[PDB]
Scaffold this active site. Sequence first.
Site, PDB file in Angstrom:
ATOM      1  N   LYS A   1     -35.605 -35.134  -2.353  1.00  0.00           N
ATOM      2  CA  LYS A   1     -35.323 -36.540  -2.602  1.00  0.00           C
ATOM      3  C   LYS A   1     -36.313 -37.381  -1.810  1.00  0.00           C
ATOM      4  O   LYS A   1     -36.599 -37.091  -0.646  1.00  0.00           O
ATOM      5  CB  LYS A   1     -33.884 -36.873  -2.193  1.00  0.00           C
ATOM      6  CG  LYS A   1     -33.068 -37.741  -3.152  1.00  0.00           C
ATOM      7  CD  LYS A   1     -31.658 -37.964  -2.550  1.00  0.00           C
ATOM      8  CE  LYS A   1     -30.773 -38.843  -3.411  1.00  0.00           C
ATOM      9  NZ  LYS A   1     -29.508 -39.304  -2.736  1.00  0.00           N
ATOM     10  N   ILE A   2     -36.864 -38.400  -2.461  1.00  0.00           N
ATOM     11  CA  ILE A   2     -37.930 -39.224  -1.901  1.00  0.00           C
ATOM     12  C   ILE A   2     -37.692 -40.674  -2.306  1.00  0.00           C
ATOM     13  O   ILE A   2     -37.503 -40.962  -3.498  1.00  0.00           O
ATOM     14  CB  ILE A   2     -39.307 -38.745  -2.390  1.00  0.00           C
ATOM     15  CG1 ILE A   2     -39.641 -37.374  -1.805  1.00  0.00           C
ATOM     16  CG2 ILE A   2     -40.376 -39.735  -2.015  1.00  0.00           C
ATOM     17  CD1 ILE A   2     -40.881 -36.784  -2.385  1.00  0.00           C
TER      18      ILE A   2
END
Lengths: 218, 217, 218, 223, 217, 223, 217, 218, 217
Positions: free
Chosen positions: G86-87
Amino acid sequence: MKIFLDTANIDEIRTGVNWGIVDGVTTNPCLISKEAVNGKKYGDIIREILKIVDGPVSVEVVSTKYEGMVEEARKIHGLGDNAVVKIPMTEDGLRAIKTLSSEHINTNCTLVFNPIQALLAAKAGVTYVSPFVGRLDDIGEDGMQIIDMIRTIFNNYIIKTQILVASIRNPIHVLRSAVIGADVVTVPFNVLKSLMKHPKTDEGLAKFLECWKKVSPD
Amino acid sequence: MKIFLDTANIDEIRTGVNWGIVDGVTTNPCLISKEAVNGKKYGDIIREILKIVDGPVSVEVVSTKYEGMVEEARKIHGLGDNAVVKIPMTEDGLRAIKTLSSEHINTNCTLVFNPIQALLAAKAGVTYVSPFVGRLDDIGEDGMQIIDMIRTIFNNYIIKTQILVASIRNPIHVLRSAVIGADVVTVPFNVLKSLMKHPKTDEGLAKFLECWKKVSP
Amino acid sequence: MKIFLDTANIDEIRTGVNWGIVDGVTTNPCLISKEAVNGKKYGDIIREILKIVDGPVSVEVVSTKYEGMVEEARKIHGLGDNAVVKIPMTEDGLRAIKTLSSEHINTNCTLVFNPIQALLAAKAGVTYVSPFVGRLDDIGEDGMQIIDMIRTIFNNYIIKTQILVASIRNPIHVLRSAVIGADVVTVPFNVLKSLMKHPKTDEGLAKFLECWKKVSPD
Amino acid sequence: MKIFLDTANIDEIRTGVNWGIVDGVTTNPCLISKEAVNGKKYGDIIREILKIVDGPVSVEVVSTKYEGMVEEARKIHGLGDNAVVKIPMTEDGLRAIKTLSSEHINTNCTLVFNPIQALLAAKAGVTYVSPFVGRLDDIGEDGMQIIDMIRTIFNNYIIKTQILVASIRNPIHVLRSAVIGADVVTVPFNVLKSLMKHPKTDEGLAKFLECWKKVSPDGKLIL
Amino acid sequence: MKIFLDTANIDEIRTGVNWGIVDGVTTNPCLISKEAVNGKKYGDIIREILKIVDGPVSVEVVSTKYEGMVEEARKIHGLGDNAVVKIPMTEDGLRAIKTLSSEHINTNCTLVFNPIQALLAAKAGVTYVSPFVGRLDDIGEDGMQIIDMIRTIFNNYIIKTQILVASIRNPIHVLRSAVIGADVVTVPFNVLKSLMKHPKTDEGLAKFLECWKKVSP
Amino acid sequence: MKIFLDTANIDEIRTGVNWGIVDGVTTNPCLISKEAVNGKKYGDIIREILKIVDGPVSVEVVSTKYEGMVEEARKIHGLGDNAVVKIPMTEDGLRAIKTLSSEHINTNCTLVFNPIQALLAAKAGVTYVSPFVGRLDDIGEDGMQIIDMIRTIFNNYIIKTQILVASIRNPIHVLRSAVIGADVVTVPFNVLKSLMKHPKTDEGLAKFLECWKKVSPDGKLIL
Amino acid sequence: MKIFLDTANIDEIRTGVNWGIVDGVTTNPCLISKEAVNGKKYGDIIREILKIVDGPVSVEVVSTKYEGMVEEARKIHGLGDNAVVKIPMTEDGLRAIKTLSSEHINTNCTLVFNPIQALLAAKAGVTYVSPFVGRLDDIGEDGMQIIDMIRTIFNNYIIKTQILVASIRNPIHVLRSAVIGADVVTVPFNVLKSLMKHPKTDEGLAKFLECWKKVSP
Amino acid sequence: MKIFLDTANIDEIRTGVNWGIVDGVTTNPCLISKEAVNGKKYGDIIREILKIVDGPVSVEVVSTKYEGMVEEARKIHGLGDNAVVKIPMTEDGLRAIKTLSSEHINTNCTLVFNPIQALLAAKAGVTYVSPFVGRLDDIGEDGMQIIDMIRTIFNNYIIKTQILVASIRNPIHVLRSAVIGADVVTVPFNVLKSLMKHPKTDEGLAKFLECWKKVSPD
Amino acid sequence: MKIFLDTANIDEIRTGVNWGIVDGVTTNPCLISKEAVNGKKYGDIIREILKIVDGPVSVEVVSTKYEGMVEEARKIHGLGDNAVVKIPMTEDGLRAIKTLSSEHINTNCTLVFNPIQALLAAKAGVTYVSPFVGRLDDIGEDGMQIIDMIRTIFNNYIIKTQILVASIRNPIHVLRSAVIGADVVTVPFNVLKSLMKHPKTDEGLAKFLECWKKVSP
C-alpha cells in the site's frame, strides 16, 4: 430544515444548544437508559432536557396499549408545552395518536419504515413522523428513498405532518434530506458537530491568518 | 389519500373501522352475494354497512337500463346520506350519472379499464371513478400506469372527480397510488391489515422494551 | 426466460408439464406439508415430482447447521440428477453452498431479500438465487426493484448464477422479470394458467370461427 | 424490417409483389372469406397466393384442438415450402407449435396481446409471433408499447422468434415498428401504398420537371 | 462522415476539390439547369464533373417510368465508374433501384422526406438514400429528426445503404449529422466554405504571428 | 377535455348528444356533401345541426378570398349563437379571423399541420385551432407530436385559443390528446362509440349478473 | 465483486475467512496500531494475517520518501506472494508505484479522494486504487459519486487497475459499489457481518421450521 | 410570441403589415443601406417605416462612444413613440442603455452571442435583447441553445427584458423560439411568408373545393 | 443576478463601477493585504471602497473568537450602512452571525464548501452565504454542483439568505450560476471585463461601420 439532536446526553445537548444550531431534541427509551446510570433516573433526565431545550422535545411512551399510551401521553404533555409525545407505528399507537391530536397534544410517530406507514400516521393527525433511514441501510435498502417518496406523498395531499428523518448515521443522510426537502432531521451529536466542518474551511482560515499577519503583525 | 375497505364482510368492516384507518367502504354484487348466504339477506347487509360506516359507502345498481338505473339509484340514495351509487361504465350508465349528478346524488363509476373511460365518467359529473388495476395486472398490463395517466388527465382539466383505485391486490398498488396522487384507494381486508406492519417496527419495539426493563424492572 | 412451477401439487405439476411451458419446479417445506396429508408422505411427494419433471426440481433442506445441510443435500442429490438443493441465506447456508458447489451438486439459495445477499450467494458458487419479490411487496417495498439491481450486478461481473424470481404473486411480476432479464421465474399454478389468457385473444378466435363458417358449413 | 401484405386479395398481392417491396403475405379466415365469394374456393385462393408469393405465406388453422391443429398444419405445410402455419395463442396452440417446431414446420402464433403471451410462443419454438397493435389501440391502450417490450424481452434472451407486428392501421405503426426494431410488419394494401408517398416528393418531382424543360423541351436525358 | 458538394457549378467544384475536403458531388435537374445556360449543354457539364471529381457523382434520371429510368441509368453508368444514378422515391423508382442493384449499378434514392421512405429505398438495395432536411425545415418540421430515426432504423437492421443528408442549409445540419452518425452530407458551396472557419481560429493565428515576430523579426 | 363529433350525419349527432358525452360538432364541406344527397340541401343540414346541438357547431366558409370569407362568416354567425365560423389557414383566412374576432364572431382555424401555423392563428385571435393529426400520420410523421408542441407554445404565452385536435382516427389520438392537455378533440362517430367500450367492462358486467342471480333469481334490486 | 476485510484484528479476520466470503484483507498504520498494544507488535500481526488469508493482503509503507517506500516495499513483498504494498497518493508514491510495477510487486494506492488522483495512480501501473468513500461522506460529499466516475473513466481507457472501494461505513456503500461495478470493496467486520442478514430471512426460516414440524416431529 | 420583420424594404414591410401578422420591425445600418440607393436617403426610409408600422421599430445608432450614442438615441426617440433605439453590446453601449433607460427611452441591445451578455444588457435596463442565432449557427454552434439558456436565466430572476430572437434563417428557428418561450422573433420576409404555408393545407383546400362543387354548381 | 467585484483594488473597483455593472464588492484579508503594501494600510482601503461603492461591500473580521468577531462586526457596521460583515463558517462564526442578525447587522458567511454548511449559515440568519466554487475545482470536484444543491435546498425551505457564488475563475462559473439561479456572483476584475466581449460582437460592429460608410461618408 429544522435540526434536532437525537440523544439524552445532557452535555451533548447543552453543547449543541449553545452552538445555536439545535432546534429540538428526540429521545427514546434506549437513549435514556444509556444516561440513567450511576444513580441518574429516567424522570430527571427528561425534566432537565425539557428545561434546557426551547424547542420540541420528543418523549416516548412505554405502554403498548391504547389506554396506557393515552394516559402516559397526557402526563408527558404536562411536563412542559415543548414536550412531544412519541408513539410507535402500531394499531394501538395510531388510535392513541388520533385521540391525542383531537386533544391538541403534539405527537411524533416513530419506528416508521415505509411510506404507507408514514401516510397512515399522517392520517391519524400526527405532528411528526420519524422514518428510520439508517436501519433501512442496515438491511441493504437505501433508506433515503423512503424519505423521497414520503415527501412526494405528503406534497400530493398537502399533508401538514412534518417529516422527521431519524436513525441518521452520516452527513449525507443530512444532505439528501435537505435536497429532498424533509422538514426535520434528528442527528447524533457526532454527526451534528461534523456538519460545520470541512478541510478547505480550515485551510482558508489559516490562509487569511497568514495574510493578516503581513499587514498587522499583532 | 382516503382509504376505503373493499368488502361486504361485516366483521372485516367493524374491525377496520375500530382501528380508525377506514374512511369508507366499496361493495359490489359479487362482494354482497359472498355474504348474503344461509339466511342473510342482501338488503340487511347493505343497511348494516351504512349504519356502521361514517364515510362513503358505494352500492352498485343491478339494472342495466337507464331508467332502471336511475330508479335503483334513488332508492340507494334514500338509504342514507353516506350512500354512493355505483354505476358501470356503459352508455346507459353515463346517461344515469349525468341525471343523478344534476340531482346532487353522489355516484361512483366502476369497471373502468383505461383513462379515456375515466375521463368520460368525469364529464358525466361522477363523484368517483374506479379503475380496476388488479384486473389489468391479470391480463398482462401494469394497471397502475392507467392510474398515472388518469391523474395527469384530471390535473390538466382541474377535474373534481375523485380517482378511486379499485381491484387492489397488494400494498404496492397502495404505495404507487399515494405516490401518483390518487384521491382514494379501496382495499380488501387482507391488504388493509398489512399496511401498518413492518418487521423493523416489530424489532424496534422489542429493542425499546428491553431498554425500558433495564431502567424499570 | 425459464418458467418454473412453485408448488408441490402433483396435479398442478402434471397439468403444467402437459402444457409444455413448465421448465422445472420449486418446492419448500410449507408447499410440501400442504400435500403431505391424508396418508401421503413428504418423501413420496418429492420422488413423484422428480419423476414427472424433466428439468430442475428444487428441494429445500431442513437442517439449520452446516453439517446437517451438506449431509441432507447429498441425500437429495441422490434422488436424481435433476434435483437442486435449496439452501437458505445464512452463514451456515453460505458455507454449505461453497462445499456443495465444489462437489458439483446444483444449489438454490433461498430467502434472499436484497441484492447484496444475492451477490454473496453467487460468490459461494450457487447455481440459482431466489429473491422473494411478493414478500417485499407485502412490507411496502417494490420487490421487483431488487431483481433489477441483482440483474445489473450479475451483468457487471459476468456472474453465472441464474436469477430465479420467487414469491411471485401476479402476471406483472412475470412481465417485469422478463423485461429486466431475469433468467427464471417460478410461479404458482394460478399465475401460470393466466399467462396464456387475454380477452382479445378469445374475441379474436370467435371472430375467426364466424368467418370460417361462412365458407365451410362443416 | 420485412414488410408483409396482410390480405387475401390476389390483385393487391400481385401489385405489391410487382413493386418489389413485399416480402410475404399473412392471411386469416376472415381475409380469405372476404375473397371467397362468387364461386372462389378457400383452397384455390390459398394455393394461388402460395404460387405468386416467393416469401412466407401465413395460413391459419381452423381446428381449435391440438390434434386437428397438427393435422391441418401438416396439410398446410405440404402445400409449399413457403407456407407458414398460423396458430392461435391458446393452451392447445402452444402444444401444437412445440410439436410442429420439432417437425421443422414454420409456425406463426397469432392473436397475441401482451408481451408474456409473445414470450410463451417463443418458448414453444414459434417462427413468428404476431401481436395485434390496432386492436390494442381500439381498447384505449397504445399497442406499440407492447411491441417495444417484446423487442426488449427477445433481445434479453437472444430469442430467434421474429416479431411480426400485425393489426396495423396507419403508417405510424410502421414507423414505430422500424424504430423499435421489429423483424416484420404486416400491412393492409392501403397502408402499403401510402408508405411510398409524401407531398414533398410530389412537389420536388414537379420542380425537377420544370427545370429540365428549361433545358430540354422534349423532356429527355440525351447522353 | 463523407462530405459531398451539392452543386453543378464547375468553379465551385474545382475550388472545393482543390481544398481537398470534397469527397463527391450531388447534382439534380435544377442544379444542372442553373449552369446549362447561354451555350453550355447539360451533357458537357455532367461529363466535366465526372472528370474533375474522383469520388461519387450522383446524376438524376429525368424519366418517370420504370423502363425509361433503367435505360437512362445505364447511360449514366456508362459515363464513368464514379457515376451514381439518382432515382426519385416513387413506385417506378423503387422497381428501377432493385433492377439496377442486381446489376451492380450504384444508385441514390432522392426526394425522401420520412424514415419509412428511406427504409423502402434501402430494401430495394439502394447505395445511398438522400432525405431532404432543409425542405422539412421549410414546412415547420425539424428535418434532422428524420435523419436521427433513419440512423436508428438502419442500425437496427444492419442496413448497408448510406444515409446521405441532402437539402442542407447551414453548418448545424452538418454538425447534427455527424453527431447522429449519418454516412454522408452533401452541402452547397457557401456552407462548405464556412465549415473550416471560426473567429477564434483567426484570433489565435494573429496571436501566434505576434509571438513569432518577437523571436524572429 | 371537450369532445366534439366530427360529422354531418344527423342520426350520429342525435345519438351522441343523447349519450350526454358530445359537447359540440365540427363540419366541413366534405362531411356535409356526404349527407347532402337525395334532395337534402346543404343549408338544411347545417340548420338542423345548429338546432339539435347546444354546444359549438363549426361550419366552414367556401370563399377563398378575404371579402367572401367575412361575408359568409357573418351569414354563418347569423344562423345561431352556437355557430363557429371555420376558416382555412391562409393569408386571407388570417386576415378574416382578425376582422371577425374584433366583431365577436367565434372562429375555428382549420387545416393546420405544424405548431407555427397554430401560433399564427392564435395571434389573429381565433377561438379554436384545428390541427389534423391523422393526415400527418398518413405522411409518416407522428401527428400527436404537433399537438404536444402547440400545447407547450400556448402554455408559454397564456394563449386562450383552444387546441381542437382534428383528423382523429383512433382512440390513441384521443388518449394522447387528453394526456397532453388539448382543450377539445373532434372524433368520427365510430371513434366516439369505441371510447366507452372495453372487454373487461363487458366481462365484469357478466360476472356481476351471475353473482346477483345467486342472490335474486328475478335479477332485481329490491330496496 | 471481491470483498476484502478492512481490519488488522486476527479474530475478525479468522471468523470472516471461515465464512467463505472474505477474499482478502486491507490494513493500514492506524488499524495495526490498534492491535499492537500490550506487548503485541506490528511485525507478528502482519505475518499472521498473511498466513491466514489466502488472497491479497495490503500492507502500508511508513516511509514518506521514494527510496524508503521502495525499500520497505521489497521487504513487504518478500513476506509472501499475496502481499500487496500500500502506497499513498503522493509525488513519491506514484514514482514508487511505477518502479514497483516494473519489478512486478503488486501495489495499492490509498488516500485517493477524487477520480483524477485514481487515474494518476492507474497510469503509474498500480494494481489497486483505494478511494475513501466514508471520508468524503464525512465532509458533506457523496463519496459513491467518485466511485461512479472512476468506473466510467477506467472503462473508457480499458484500465486494468482494480477499483477497491475503501472507508466503507454501511451496507449501502456495498450495494452501490456492486451496482456501479467496482472490482472490490473492503469492509469493517461489523459491516461484513450485517451483509448476510435480513429480517425477512429470519421470518422465512421460522415459517419453514414450523411447517416442517407439522410433517416430521 | 411577437413576430417582427427584419428588413428595411418598404414593400416587404407594407406587405407584412397588410397580413396582420407583423408586430414591429427591426432595422440595422446594413439593412438600411441596401434600400438607400437610387436616390432614397436613409433618413426618409426610417421615417417611412415608423409611419407604416404601429408597433416597435428598432433603429440602430451609428456612434461607438457613449455620448454620441445617447445624443443619437434622443434624436431617434424624437422620430416617434414607437421608435426603439438599438445599441450594441459594448462597454459604452451598456452605459448608454442605463442612461436611456432612466430617460424612459426604449432600447434594444444587439450583437449578443451568449447568455451572460444578454443578462448584462437586462441589468442595464434594456427593453429588448437581440441574440443572433443564425450567426452562431454559421460558426458551428447551435444558436438556439443560447436562447434556451437566456429564457431560463430571465425566468430565474423575473427579468422584464424581452428576448428578441434575431439573425433568424429558417422556420425552425421560429418553431424552437416559440417552444422555448422567447418573447419575440424578428424574421426576414422570406421566412415570414413561409410560416403560413404547408402542402397539406393546400391539398386540404383542393379537397374541400371539390366537395363544395358536388353540392353547389356556382 | 447581482454581480459583485471580488477585489480590494480601488482602480479595478473604480473602473467597474463606472461601467454600471458592478452591484457591490467583496473583500477578504488576503485581497486587502495585497493592497496594503508600500505604506498603504487596510483601514483607508476599506473606507475608500465603502465610499465609491453604492451597494453592499463585504469586510471580513479577523478575530477567530466569538466576542472578537462580534466586537469587530459592530466597528465594521459603523463604517457605513452598506457594509456587510464577513464571518467564516465556524462554531463561533455561526454564534456571531445569529447575534449580529438579531442586531440587524448584515452578514456574509464565507469559506463554505458544501450545501449543509450553507444551510447551517442560513439557519443562523446570515444575509449572504459564499460557497467557494474555484477552490472545489482546484481539488478535483465540480464546484458548481454545490451551488446547484444550495439553490434547491434554499428553494425547498423558502430561505431568504442570498447565494453569493465566490472564488469564481472563469465566465462559465458565471454562466452556470445564472442558469442555476444564484442570487449573486462575485468575480475578479479580469473575469468581469471578459463578460461583455465576444468575437462575433466585434465582427458585427465592423460590418455595421462598413455599411454606414457606404451611406454617410
